[PDB]
Write a protein that binds this ligand. Structure first.
Ligand SMILES: NC(=O)c1ccc[n+]([C@@H]2O[C@H](COP(=O)([O-])OP(=O)(O)OC[C@H]3O[C@@H](n4cnc5c(N)ncnc54)[C@H](O)[C@@H]3O)[C@@H](O)[C@H]2O)c1
Ligand SMILES: NC(=O)c1ccc[n+]([C@@H]2O[C@H](COP(=O)([O-])OP(=O)(O)OC[C@H]3O[C@@H](n4cnc5c(N)ncnc54)[C@H](O)[C@@H]3O)[C@@H](O)[C@H]2O)c1
Ligand SMILES: Cc1nc2ccccc2n1S(=O)(=O)c1ccc(F)cc1
Ligand SMILES: Cc1nc2ccccc2n1S(=O)(=O)c1ccc(F)cc1
Ligand SMILES: [K+]
Ligand SMILES: [K+]
Ligand SMILES: [K+]
Ligand SMILES: [K+]
Lengths: 446, 447
């Protein structure tokens, strides 16, 4: 079959030793760099057709971070790939003790649809840098990006080492029967379990980048002008279709009306009085998801927005108030421009609220008080944390990006991507000379 | 069930926050130091009854490294647990960026039988230091150690946080239905797949410490006296029942006879003429494994040993020559005192041989030529590597221990244990003051 052959050719090319020299990897990454520069309009086009992105946010909210990752990895590769000496003991002074980094082999990257370039290519960059063959499975939901990547990747990159495989569920099930040396999966908690089950059959290590509801706690005595502007930015970009979007707000009932009004002011600033007319406002990926997000608005108190167009898959920036935690909008990942506000009367109640639910990919807190920040961090568990801003904690090379519990396992970005797509091999090199100090270990015992 | 209640009590005790302060963790580790000191003779008795270990090798080939691990972690815990500052970027000048370490929750440790104290308690030490509740599932095959640990662990460690669950396959199957936040499993490649399949149902991360056949390449132009003494020591300790034992030898046919003779000399030095009489020589764990290893000797050219005793599960140190790589002794992990010699005509042939097989837990090479050492490392893959020795690489705090591919995933020992049993949480703390530099990111976008 097409899938079986593509994978075969990928392993055969890895087995030939082609990817081992650092210069080969760098040249593949520089080819990727040229692909992004030369196919920029095509990439914008794909994102515009899939998610209603424009040339600005297609670049500065997705593409640029791939480029920054490529530049960073090219520069750092010599340092990362070097044998790393580790601390010796008095008994191992004459020995070499070091960590040897080596490729895993054939890596499978399964992408998702909300950032269909970044979440296919940024994992790929790390895997290429680590010296792996990389099989790409882009999301079928983002049809235009999926089609484009299958076309343009083989034009710039090694055709055998880095194949693109497109398809739906059966094709993915078929792909998952193939033997890989690592699988990075970005997607749902439910399918994540299926991915790990398939990986178990070949003892394939997994990086699962999954979902959940990222809580956003707003402290009663903080600058709400700054806070709500930052929150509205993170929540409503890509029409709320961000894994690290502030899913819901936790706040004192005394500031709920103030929060509504400031989110309001920020949303008008960003997208005008009518967001349907903003070139900067996105659309829902599919009809299936449009219906889902609209269904979560039913039976709720709509403080802002609430209306949607099925033909264009537009959903107005919606703010819900006094939301019952047991209602549908607070029982699933929204992944849409619907921001529910849930009232809690203390920091302690907020911590308990977060702790009683599944561990989120991101946790957000807005507070002028640092003890509040540190207390919430120490008493909760989440993939990552950002205090007094949203989203940005995943844009920094020095901060590994990943989940915990239901939000996932493993992590990547920057050096972590190199590590994750490598095997770190402990090495002890000794002289083959008679050492009297070793005599104690040999039988007979004293 | 008793299994469900024990896991429930462990989660409840963790959810209380009891393990969070470092003093509490240190106190549990000190209790393990106390356990080892006060139960030394009982630990020896268990290992003697299970594996025919003696008071010396029970301590110096197992127990002492748990103690060293405990001493090391107690000292380093403040350093490890502290928030880790990371490198800033030009825009993140006024921000705090760090990595915050936190426990995962309830960790399950499934131990194996060959080093039944070390491979239950060393992983536990790491999981304790990282602030987890820890459920211990000792191997049923090492019966005496399993029983002892069920008795002595609650006598020293917190009873709710650190329960011991004994049982066979049915009990483990039920235990694997419980929800854990991490599982460290030490055992076979096949059962590793079963554990990972179970873990998938709860999205539980796994550290799998598995098996394979660790190759030992012996170069032509090296000191064979020194080499074979080191090899024989690694291969024949614990009656060959070591995951990182040099499973088989790859060498040029021109040095095969010399290797045989020098292995024989070393074995005579170690255990005498008749190893059955040596206090330092172990026994096979079970009747099933006795028959299995004896089966692997059949049809082979025996150059030394080759005999056994079913009643005592004794198998004489055995060397096999001119071994067909396709024969039974070369198609499975031996895990016994049978050392096959397989002939290769070059380093290149040896590299190809290793690469055709599944990735081993350890890879060994003996050579005076650094280029041979570096080429074999660069062109092969294995969990860990030692050049000009065996076993030792697993005893060092600064070298993480674990497999790759069929030999496993993840790693532990030293700092790596703390990291493996923690969630490393990326944290960005910004000031809540107006920043003009951030305004560029907000809509509306420029034309
Ligand atoms: N952590 C991250 O980095 C990150 C990034 C983006 C999105 N996400 C998460 O992804 C989720 C949304 O993305 P999504 O792609 O799951 O959307 P979705 O669930 O709408 O997409 C359905 C996808 O699942 C696949 N699928 C369905 N059944 C399958 C089976 N039996 N086997 C294999 N594949 C199967 C389909 O092929 C399809 O691609 C959100 O929960 C979000 O939090 C996480
Ligand atoms: N990497 C390491 O740290 C390390 C250390 C020691 C041993 N090992 C490996 O362990 C292997 C031998 O140890 P072993 O414990 O597998 O002994 P073994 O092969 O005798 O296996 C018996 C064990 O498997 C379990 N088992 C069997 N079927 C099962 C099922 N369906 N579900 C759950 N459990 C099941 C049994 O309960 C029993 O405990 C060797 O391959 C060795 O390399 C690895
Ligand atoms: C760098 C990065 N890591 C991500 C992880 C998940 C989703 C998008 C991600 N991105 S991203 O697409 O580049 C990105 C998305 C939004 C944003 F505001 C800034 C960056
Ligand atoms: C420290 C250590 N790491 C291990 C990993 C696997 C099996 C035994 C292990 N040990 S051990 O039992 O202490 C050990 C075993 C044999 C030996 F020679 C020295 C130490
Ligand atoms: K309501
Ligand atoms: K001695
Ligand atoms: K630290
Ligand atoms: K602006």
């Amino acid at each position: 079959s097409k899938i079986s052959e593509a994978v075969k050719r990928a392993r055969a090319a890895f087995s030939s030793g082609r990817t081992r020299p650092l210069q080969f990897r760098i040249q593949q990454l520089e080819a990727l760099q040229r692909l992004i520069q030369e196919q920029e309009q095509e990439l914008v086009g794909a994102l515009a057709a899939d998610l209603h992105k424009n040339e600005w946010n297609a670049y500065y909210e997705e593409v640029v971070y791939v480029l920054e990752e490529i530049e960073y990895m090219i520069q750092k590769l010599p340092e990362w790939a070097a044998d790393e000496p580790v601390e010796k003991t008095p008994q191992t002074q004459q020995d070499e003790l070091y960590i040897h980094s080596e490729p895993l082999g054939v890596v499978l990257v399964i992408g998702t649809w909300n950032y269909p370039f970044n979440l296919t290519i940024q994992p790929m960059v790390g895997a290429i840098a680590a010296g792996n063959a990389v099989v790409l499975k882009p999301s079928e939901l983002s049809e235009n990006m999926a089609s484009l990547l299958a076309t343009i990747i083989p034009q710039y990159l090694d055709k055998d080492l880095y194949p693109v495989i497109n398809g739906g569920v059966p094709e993915t099930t078929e792909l998952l029967k193939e033997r890989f040396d690592h699988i990075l999966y970005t997607g749902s908690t439910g399918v994540g379990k299926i991915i790990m089950t398939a990986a178990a059959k070949h003892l394939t290590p997994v990086t699962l980048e999954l979902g959940g509801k990222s809580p956003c706690y707003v402290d009663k005595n903080c600058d709400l002008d700054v806070a709500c502007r930052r929150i509205a930015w993170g929540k409503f970009m890509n029409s709320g279709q961000t894994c690290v979007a502030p899913d819901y707000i936790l706040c004192d009932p005394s500031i709920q009306n103030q929060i509504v009004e400031k989110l309001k002011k920020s949303l008008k600033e960003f997208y005008g009085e009518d967001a349907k007319k903003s070139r900067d406002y996105g659309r829902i990926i599919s009809a299936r998801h449009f219906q889902r997000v609209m269904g979560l608005i039913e039976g709720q108190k709509v403080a802002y927005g609430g209306t949607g167009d099925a033909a264009t898959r537009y959903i107005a920036p919606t703010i819900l108030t006094d939301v019952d935690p047991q209602s549908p909008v607070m029982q699933e990942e929204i992944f849409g421009p619907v921001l529910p506000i849930v009232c809690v009367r203390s920091l302690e109640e907020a911590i308990q609220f977060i702790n009683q639910r599944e561990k989120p990919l991101a946790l957000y807190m807005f507070s002028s008080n640092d003890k509040v920040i540190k207390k919430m961090i120490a008493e909760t568990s989440s993939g990552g944390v950002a205090a007094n801003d949203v989203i940005v904690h995943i844009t920094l090379h020095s901060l590994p990006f990943g989940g915990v519990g239901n939000s996932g396992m493993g992590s990547y970005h920057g050096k972590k991507s190199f590590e994750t797509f490598s095997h770190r091999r402990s090495c002890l090199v000794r002289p083959l000379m008679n050492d009297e100090g070793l005599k104690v270990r040999y039988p007979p015992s004293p």
